[PDB]
Write an enzyme that holds these catalytic residues in place. Structure first.
Site, PDB file in Angstrom:
ATOM      1  N   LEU A  20     148.102  53.184 -11.799  1.00  0.00           N
ATOM      2  CA  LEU A  20     148.829  51.944 -11.455  1.00  0.00           C
ATOM      3  C   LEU A  20     149.940  51.612 -12.443  1.00  0.00           C
ATOM      4  CD1 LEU A  20     145.768  49.807 -10.313  1.00  0.00           C
ATOM      5  CD2 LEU A  20     147.378  51.140  -8.912  1.00  0.00           C
ATOM      6  N   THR A  22     151.541  51.282 -16.625  1.00  0.00           N
ATOM      7  CA  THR A  22     151.203  50.610 -17.884  1.00  0.00           C
ATOM      8  C   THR A  22     151.198  49.096 -17.623  1.00  0.00           C
ATOM      9  OG1 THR A  22     153.498  50.763 -18.696  1.00  0.00           O
ATOM     10  CG2 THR A  22     151.990  52.530 -19.337  1.00  0.00           C
ATOM     11  N   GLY A  23     150.054  48.471 -17.892  1.00  0.00           N
ATOM     12  CA  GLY A  23     149.876  47.041 -17.673  1.00  0.00           C
ATOM     13  C   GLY A  23     149.983  46.270 -18.970  1.00  0.00           C
ATOM     14  N   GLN A  24     149.551  45.009 -18.958  1.00  0.00           N
ATOM     15  CA  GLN A  24     149.495  44.212 -20.194  1.00  0.00           C
ATOM     16  C   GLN A  24     148.440  44.792 -21.175  1.00  0.00           C
ATOM     17  N   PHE A  25     148.933  45.347 -22.273  1.00  0.00           N
ATOM     18  CA  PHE A  25     148.091  45.829 -23.374  1.00  0.00           C
ATOM     19  C   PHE A  25     147.371  47.164 -23.070  1.00  0.00           C
ATOM     20  CE2 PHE A  25     147.492  40.951 -23.141  1.00  0.00           C
ATOM     21  CZ  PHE A  25     148.715  40.683 -23.759  1.00  0.00           C
ATOM     22  N   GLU A  87     137.971  43.297 -11.015  1.00  0.00           N
ATOM     23  CA  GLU A  87     138.364  43.184  -9.611  1.00  0.00           C
ATOM     24  C   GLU A  87     139.698  43.903  -9.372  1.00  0.00           C
ATOM     25  OE1 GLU A  87     138.366  39.044  -8.541  1.00  0.00           O
ATOM     26  OE2 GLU A  87     139.009  39.521  -6.452  1.00  0.00           O
ATOM     27  N   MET A  89     143.199  44.312  -7.441  1.00  0.00           N
ATOM     28  CA  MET A  89     144.222  43.398  -6.810  1.00  0.00           C
ATOM     29  C   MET A  89     145.339  44.282  -6.263  1.00  0.00           C
ATOM     30  SD  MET A  89     142.906  40.394  -7.419  1.00  0.00           S
ATOM     31  CE  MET A  89     144.256  39.215  -7.268  1.00  0.00           C
ATOM     32  N   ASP A 133     147.896  32.151 -22.483  1.00  0.00           N
ATOM     33  CA  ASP A 133     149.141  32.852 -22.153  1.00  0.00           C
ATOM     34  C   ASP A 133     149.374  32.898 -20.652  1.00  0.00           C
ATOM     35  OD1 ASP A 133     151.626  34.065 -22.481  1.00  0.00           O
ATOM     36  OD2 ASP A 133     150.782  36.057 -22.792  1.00  0.00           O
ATOM     37  N   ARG A 137     153.559  36.821 -15.118  1.00  0.00           N
ATOM     38  CA  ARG A 137     153.327  38.211 -15.538  1.00  0.00           C
ATOM     39  C   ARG A 137     151.875  38.523 -15.720  1.00  0.00           C
ATOM     40  NH1 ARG A 137     152.790  36.929 -20.915  1.00  0.00           N
ATOM     41  NH2 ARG A 137     154.071  35.080 -21.336  1.00  0.00           N
ATOM     42  N   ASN A 138     150.985  37.546 -15.769  1.00  0.00           N
ATOM     43  CA  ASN A 138     149.551  37.913 -15.676  1.00  0.00           C
ATOM     44  C   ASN A 138     148.805  37.151 -14.616  1.00  0.00           C
ATOM     45  OD1 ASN A 138     148.959  35.525 -16.931  1.00  0.00           O
ATOM     46  ND2 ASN A 138     149.444  36.462 -18.996  1.00  0.00           N
ATOM     47  N   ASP A 151     143.862  38.170 -17.346  1.00  0.00           N
ATOM     48  CA  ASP A 151     144.140  38.269 -18.800  1.00  0.00           C
ATOM     49  C   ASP A 151     143.854  36.980 -19.516  1.00  0.00           C
ATOM     50  OD1 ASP A 151     144.761  40.949 -18.714  1.00  0.00           O
ATOM     51  OD2 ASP A 151     146.940  40.605 -18.838  1.00  0.00           O
ATOM     52  N   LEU A 154     142.958  36.627 -23.372  1.00  0.00           N
ATOM     53  CA  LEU A 154     142.956  37.942 -24.001  1.00  0.00           C
ATOM     54  C   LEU A 154     143.913  38.064 -25.177  1.00  0.00           C
ATOM     55  CD1 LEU A 154     141.508  40.627 -23.428  1.00  0.00           C
ATOM     56  CD2 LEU A 154     143.567  41.275 -22.066  1.00  0.00           C
TER      57      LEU A 154
HETATM   58  C1  LIG Z   1     151.177  42.777 -13.434  1.00  0.00           C
HETATM   59  C2  LIG Z   1     150.895  41.289 -13.413  1.00  0.00           C
HETATM   60  C3  LIG Z   1     150.553  43.503 -14.407  1.00  0.00           C
HETATM   61  C4  LIG Z   1     150.729  44.963 -14.607  1.00  0.00           C
HETATM   62  O1  LIG Z   1     151.122  45.297 -15.714  1.00  0.00           O
HETATM   63  N1  LIG Z   1     150.378  45.863 -13.651  1.00  0.00           N
HETATM   64  C5  LIG Z   1     150.515  47.329 -13.834  1.00  0.00           C
HETATM   65  C6  LIG Z   1     149.095  47.651 -13.430  1.00  0.00           C
HETATM   66  C7  LIG Z   1     148.596  46.640 -12.406  1.00  0.00           C
HETATM   67  N2  LIG Z   1     147.291  46.000 -12.638  1.00  0.00           N
HETATM   68  C8  LIG Z   1     146.729  45.422 -13.709  1.00  0.00           C
HETATM   69  O2  LIG Z   1     147.350  45.332 -14.843  1.00  0.00           O
HETATM   70  N3  LIG Z   1     145.507  44.899 -13.473  1.00  0.00           N
HETATM   71  C9  LIG Z   1     144.678  44.370 -14.379  1.00  0.00           C
HETATM   72  C10 LIG Z   1     144.891  43.226 -15.181  1.00  0.00           C
HETATM   73  C11 LIG Z   1     143.988  42.801 -16.107  1.00  0.00           C
HETATM   74  C12 LIG Z   1     142.843  43.525 -16.371  1.00  0.00           C
HETATM   75  O3  LIG Z   1     142.009  43.105 -17.318  1.00  0.00           O
HETATM   76  C13 LIG Z   1     141.530  41.799 -17.404  1.00  0.00           C
HETATM   77  C14 LIG Z   1     141.294  41.001 -16.295  1.00  0.00           C
HETATM   78  C15 LIG Z   1     140.758  39.753 -16.483  1.00  0.00           C
HETATM   79  C16 LIG Z   1     140.541  39.240 -17.755  1.00  0.00           C
HETATM   80  C17 LIG Z   1     140.823  39.992 -18.857  1.00  0.00           C
HETATM   81  C18 LIG Z   1     141.297  41.296 -18.655  1.00  0.00           C
HETATM   82  C19 LIG Z   1     142.590  44.679 -15.651  1.00  0.00           C
HETATM   83  C20 LIG Z   1     143.532  45.099 -14.723  1.00  0.00           C
HETATM   84  C21 LIG Z   1     145.246  45.251 -12.185  1.00  0.00           C
HETATM   85  C22 LIG Z   1     144.162  44.905 -11.305  1.00  0.00           C
HETATM   86  N4  LIG Z   1     142.989  44.194 -11.629  1.00  0.00           N
HETATM   87  N5  LIG Z   1     144.291  45.370 -10.021  1.00  0.00           N
HETATM   88  C23 LIG Z   1     145.390  45.975  -9.586  1.00  0.00           C
HETATM   89  N6  LIG Z   1     146.436  46.290 -10.343  1.00  0.00           N
HETATM   90  C24 LIG Z   1     146.411  45.901 -11.641  1.00  0.00           C
HETATM   91  C25 LIG Z   1     149.694  45.544 -12.420  1.00  0.00           C
END
Ligand SMILES: */C(C)=C\C(=O)N1CC[C@@H](n2c(=O)n(-c3ccc(Oc4ccccc4)cc3)c3c(N)ncnc32)C1
Length: 271
Positions: A20, A22-25, A87, A89, A133, A137-138, A151, A154
């Site tokens: 998917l 590079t996401g946040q962190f 979960e 998304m 935060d 973006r999150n 996030d 976090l």
């Molecule tokens: C866009 C808002 C963020 C981003 O950078 N994306 C590239 C990958 C895709 N993505 C995710 O980043 N996440 C996701 C976010 C957060 C977590 O960890 C977390 C959740 C709740 C509390 C603390 C930490 C995991 C993953 C995705 C998810 N869940 N589904 C689909 N695509 C995701 C967007």
């Protein structure tokens, strides 16, 4: 099973299906847990997080459960990189979703997005849990178009270089109230301020807040008592809601419960 706390997922139960990006962190993948359940898997790079503190907080985060909060299912910490299992998304980042003009959003949809986030934040506030935060973006979007908050909390565990790299500055200046920028005074009312900025981001279809200013210039603007102004898609009633989040005095800003009430009232009037 043996060897795992209630917060710990056995990574052997994961099937990886798609990258998917590079996401946040960290890097994020889509997969399945025990063959059937969709999950997202966020991989935390060595050196990017205060890991023992994060793991302790994950136990608390596991018990946060709301329909508009991205659910943390568990963590995998017996290897590096550590995994966060959450979960899934399907429709990705809220900002990217807003910015796709093909969606041709109605304002009722934009209001519903605000309501989704407000419900999540009202829940967190009821648990005395600060997001710290909040920003478009999150927030993430599922396959049904539901926006959920992600996030949460976090940023407390992110070591300096990863925060800067992933967010694009040492700090989220554009989502911060005067008392944060001046004195580092975080509170429920800094989450309220950020929520108003997020409403602005939604109604502006993903424009950067203070889009012609640097962070430095933004902090000066807010210091002078100046604010974002009304997105073209926002009615006067909606602008009044977002603007209420930006009172110079933190104690004069609403709660999330009051915001929710205000949002429902506009949904009923603008039906
Ligand atoms: C866009 C808002 C963020 C981003 O950078 N994306 C590239 C990958 C895709 N993505 C995710 O980043 N996440 C996701 C976010 C957060 C977590 O960890 C977390 C959740 C709740 C509390 C603390 C930490 C995991 C993953 C995705 C998810 N869940 N589904 C689909 N695509 C995701 C967007």
């Amino acid at each position: 099973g043996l060897g795992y706390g209630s917060w710990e997922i056995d990574p052997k139960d994961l099937t990886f299906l798609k990258e998917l990006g590079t996401g946040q962190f960290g890097v994020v993948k889509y997969g399945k847990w025990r063959g059937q359940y969709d999950v997202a898997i966020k991989m935390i790079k060595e050196g990017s997080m205060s890991e023992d503190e994060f793991i302790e907080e994950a136990k608390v985060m596991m018990n946060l459960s709301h329909e508009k909060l991205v659910q943390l299912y568990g963590v995998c910490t017996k290897q590096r990189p550590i995994f966060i299992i959450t979960e899934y998304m399907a429709n990705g980042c809220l900002l990217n979703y807003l910015r796709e003009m093909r969606h041709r959003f109605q304002t009722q949809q934009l209001l519903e997005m605000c309501k989704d986030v407000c419900e999540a934040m009202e829940y967190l506030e009821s648990k005395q849990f600060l997001h710290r935060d909040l920003a478009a973006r999150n927030c993430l979007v599922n396959d049904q178009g539901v926006v959920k908050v992600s996030d949460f909390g976090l940023s407390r565990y992110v070591l300096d270089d990863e925060y800067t790299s992933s967010v694009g500055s040492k700090f989220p200046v554009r989502w911060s109230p005067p008392e944060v920028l001046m004195y580092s005074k975080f509170s429920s009312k800094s989450d309220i301020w950020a929520f108003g900025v997020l409403m602005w981001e939604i109604y502006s279809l993903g424009k950067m807040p203070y889009e012609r200013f640097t962070n430095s210039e933004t902090a000066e603007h807010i210091a002078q008592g100046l604010r974002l102004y009304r997105p073209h898609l926002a009615s006067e009633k909606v602008y009044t809601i977002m603007y209420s989040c930006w009172h110079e005095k933190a104690d004069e800003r609403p709660t999330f419960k009051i915001l929710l009430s205000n949002i429902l009232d506009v949904m009923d009037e603008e039906s």
